[PDB]
A = this chain, B = another copy of it.
Amino acid sequence: TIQEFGTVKQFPVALTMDTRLYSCQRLNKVLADTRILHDLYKKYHWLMRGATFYQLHLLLDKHAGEQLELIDTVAERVQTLGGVAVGDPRHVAEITTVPRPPDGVEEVPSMLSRLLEAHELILTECHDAAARTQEYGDDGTNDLLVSEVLRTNELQAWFVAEHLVDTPLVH
């Protein structure tokens, strides 16, 4: 094994080893939680049912695609810093704090609430990680976490949360 998980290599990218180590630790937690959220979106894209099936099917897929891009961008930021991005999902399972859903099919409003819980969890960790990596001098990491991870999750949580509003649709 030529590089252990949790170490960084000597990289000429104008950031100290301690800053790069710290950023990789923070990014990998966001990454593990985003991996789970992408798979929750795909799970609900497949398992959806009900009179709004096609609308929610399509919405959940649009969110999964955007989460997939977040995953790749965050992982490549870990590599760019000289670290090792979390790889196999059995490792993601050890790092993440997004809870495991039931193996079978939940009620539709439970599926939506679970996605929102995951969004809020990531959003909270993201605000803190963005603040701390900035304090370490890692401007590029802070910009990634805010402009991409935080803004994408906030807009997604909006689209999902408005579907849970119980309000009449016809007079």
Contact = CB atoms under 8 A, between A and B. Distances in A.
A104 B1 contact: yes
Interface string A136-154: 0101101110110011001
A99 B67 CA distance: 26
B51 A163 contact: yes
Contact of A49 (B120, B162, B171): B162
Interface string A9-20: 001111000000
A142 B131 CA distance: 13
A89 to B, nearest CB: 3
Contacts of A13: 119-120, 123, 154, 157-158
The count of identical subunits is: 11
Contact of A85 (B43, B88, B143): B43
A131 B158 CA distance: 24
A47 B144 contact: no
A75 interface: yes
Interface string A40-54: 101100111111111
B80 A158 contact: yes
A156 to B, nearest CB: 9
A93 B89 contact: yes
Contacts of A46: 72, 75-76, 78-79, 85, 87
19 contacts: A2-B49, A7-B104, A14-B120, A36-B88, A43-B85, A46-B76, A46-B85, A46-B87, A49-B165, A51-B165, A52-B52, A53-B165, A54-B56, A76-B155, A88-B100, A91-B103, A110-B171, A127-B137, A164-B170
